């Protein structure tokens, strides 16, 4: 078959067919970093405000992990 | 009415654009009106100044 | 579904599409009332300073 989806109803038809990109590659990498840190110890607006709390938390988790391993190294430089 | 109505909805999309475009062009006319009626307000202010000059 | 149900769905939809454009059209020319005073006021003022 051949569909013709207009631009007004495009995300809704695509999410309907699902039930019947460098941005979300980067955010996939950031969710992978959040999955590595824990192991180490929808509308368009509803995605757009939750990608904000993915990025805003990935930034603080990365800086707090990089201010922790580089401090563990400084600890071992005194224990040696 | 399935295969009549789709043609009708198709026509509304072109008409929708057209109402908007006609208002966007109305706007453009308003801008020219501003330059025209202002061109007239300056030479009527010239003679206002020439009126109180020939009085002095 | 049925020809009545699609007809109903039809009157609501072409109504929303059309009404929305007409309401947006109002917003464009509401903004044109603002630009008419603003350009007219700038243009007149610049010249009337020189006239004075």
């Amino acid at each position: 078959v051949q569909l013709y989806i207009p631009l007004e109803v495009i995300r809704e038809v695509t999410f309907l067919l699902g039930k019947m990109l460098r941005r979300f590659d980067e955010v996939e990498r950031m969710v992978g970093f959040l999955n590595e840190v824990v192991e180490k110890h929808l509308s368009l607006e509803n995605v757009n405000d939750m990608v904000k709390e993915i990025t805003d938390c990935e930034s603080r988790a990365r800086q707090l992990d990089e201010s922790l391993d580089s401090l563990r190294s400084k600890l071992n430089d005194l224990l040696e | 009415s399935q295969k009549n109505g789709i043609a009708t909805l198709l026509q509304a999309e072109k008409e929708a654009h057209e109402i908007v475009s006609k208002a966007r062009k109305y706007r453009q006319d308003k801008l020219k009106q501003a330059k025209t009626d202002a061109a007239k307000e300056i030479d009527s202010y010239k003679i206002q100044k020439d009126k109180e000059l020939k009085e002095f | 579904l049925t020809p009545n149900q699609v007809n109903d769905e039809l009157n609501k939809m072409q109504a929303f599409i059309r009404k929305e454009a007409e309401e947006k059209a109002k917003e464009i020319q509401l903004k044109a009332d603002q630009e008419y005073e603003i350009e007219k006021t700038n243009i007149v003022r610049n010249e009337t300073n020189n006239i004075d």
């Binding site: 078959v1 051949q2 569909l3 013709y4 989806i5 207009p6 007004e8 109803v9 809704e12 038809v13 309907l16 019947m20 | 399935q2 109505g5 789709i6 909805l9 198709l10 509304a12 999309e13 | 579904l1 699609v6 769905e9 039809l10 609501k12 939809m13 072409q14 109504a15 929303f16 599409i17 059309r18």
Partner: peptide
Amino acid sequence: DSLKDYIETLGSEYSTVFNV
């Protein structure tokens, strides 16, 4: 029957075309 009901229930009067 699912594409026809869904594009009409949300408004947005620009219908899709489903050919075979």
